[PDB]
Amino acid sequence: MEMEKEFEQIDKSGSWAAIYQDIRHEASDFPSRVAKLPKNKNRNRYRDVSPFDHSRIKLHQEDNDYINASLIKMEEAQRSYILTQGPLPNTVGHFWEMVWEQKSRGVVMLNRVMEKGSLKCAQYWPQKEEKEMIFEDTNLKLTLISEDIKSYYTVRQLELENLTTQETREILHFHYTTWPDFGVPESPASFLNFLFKVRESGSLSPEHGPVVVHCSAGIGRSGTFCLADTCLLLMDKRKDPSSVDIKKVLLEMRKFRMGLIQTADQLRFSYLAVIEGAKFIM
Ligand SMILES: CC(C)(CO)NC(=O)c1cccc(Cl)c1
Numbered sequence: 001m002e003m004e005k006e007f008e009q010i011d012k013s014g015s016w017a018a019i020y021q022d023i024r025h026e027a028s029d030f031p032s033r034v035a036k037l038p039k040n041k042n043r044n045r046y047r048d049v050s051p052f053d054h055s056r057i058k059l060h061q062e063d064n065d066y067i068n069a070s071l072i073k074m075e076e077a078q079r080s081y082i083l084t085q086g087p088l089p090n091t092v093g094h095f096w097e098m099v100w101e102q103k104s105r106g107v108v109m110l111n112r113v114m115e116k117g118s119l120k121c122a123q124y125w126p127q128k129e130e131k132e133m134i135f136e137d138t139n140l141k142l143t144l145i146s147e148d149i150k151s152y153y154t155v156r157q158l159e160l161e162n163l164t165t166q167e168t169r170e171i172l173h174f175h176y177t178t179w180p181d182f183g184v185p186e187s188p189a190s191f192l193n194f195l196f197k198v199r200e201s202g203s204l205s206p207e208h209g210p211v212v213v214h215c216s217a218g219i220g221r222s223g224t225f226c227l228a229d230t231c232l233l234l235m236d237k238r239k240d241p242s243s244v245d246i247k248k249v250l251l252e253m254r255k256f257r258m259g260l261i262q263t264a265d266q267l268r269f270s271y272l273a274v275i276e277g278a279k280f281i282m
Pocket residue numbers: 060061097100101136137138139140161162163164165
């Protein structure tokens with residue numbers, strides 16, 4: 001079926017939970033043996049969210065190459081994304097090592113450091129120009145260059161230096177700051193505006209390594225971001241845009257990381273975002 005009318009048909013019939021449970025039943029199951037090794041317990045935020053072995057990002061290190069991060073490679077859309085958990089106190093150096101090694105231009109953050117009164121990820125970037133951060137375990141230096149605070153999101157320019165070679169690179173930090181502590185946003189307008197700002201920066205384009213996107217677990221809000229982006233790109237590329245099937249695209253993405261889209265409300269929000277986005281594109 002088309003999307004907008006499939007949408008109203010699920011709303012009128014109140015069957016979002018049944019649609020979402022079908023997706024969960026049909027989703028891929030692949031091994032995640034490296035994630036479950038005992039030496040990696042303090043590298044995982046949640047025991048039930050792990051990268052598959054076949055698609056995990058490897059650190060270029062011989063001691064321990066493990067990080068909780070996955071490469072989502074979308075062949076028809078010609079887009080790639082790295083989805084990862086919010087960094088932990090003992091993985092902030094690994095996180096920036098990955099950004100460096102994968103040649104990423106941008107980092108997309110969809111959570112606040114504290115939500116619901118608890119810590120959802122480490123404070124992993126510097127908050128003042130004159131107070132830079134040094135990650136001694138991976139030999140990197142990170143400096144805040146500039147910050148632009150808007151009503152729904154903040155964009156930061158960062159300098160990452162490889163202290164071994166003295167090479168430097170400019171990284172863009174795109175921080176969506178207004179996702180509610182509970183539920184999903186009422187309107188997708190600010191989320192779509194944010195997606196378009198990431199696109200306009202070049203961070204999603206083939207002349208760079210894959211964008212790094214995270215929330216707390218790296219599957220819910222993060223899944224919503226890449227699902228909406230890929231669906232809108234396919235609607236632009238194909239002769240018949242009504243052939244784009246968001247459930248099929250989501251199942252394709254779940255070949256590369258488990259659990260993408262965590263609730264039926266996140267599924268409905270993803271439909272809403274793609275529907276409204278497709279009208280603005282033209
Ligand atoms: C990312 C770079 C190349 C930047 O200095 N660092 C490393 O690869 C690294 C990894 C593990 C340990 C240490 Cl000392 C450096």
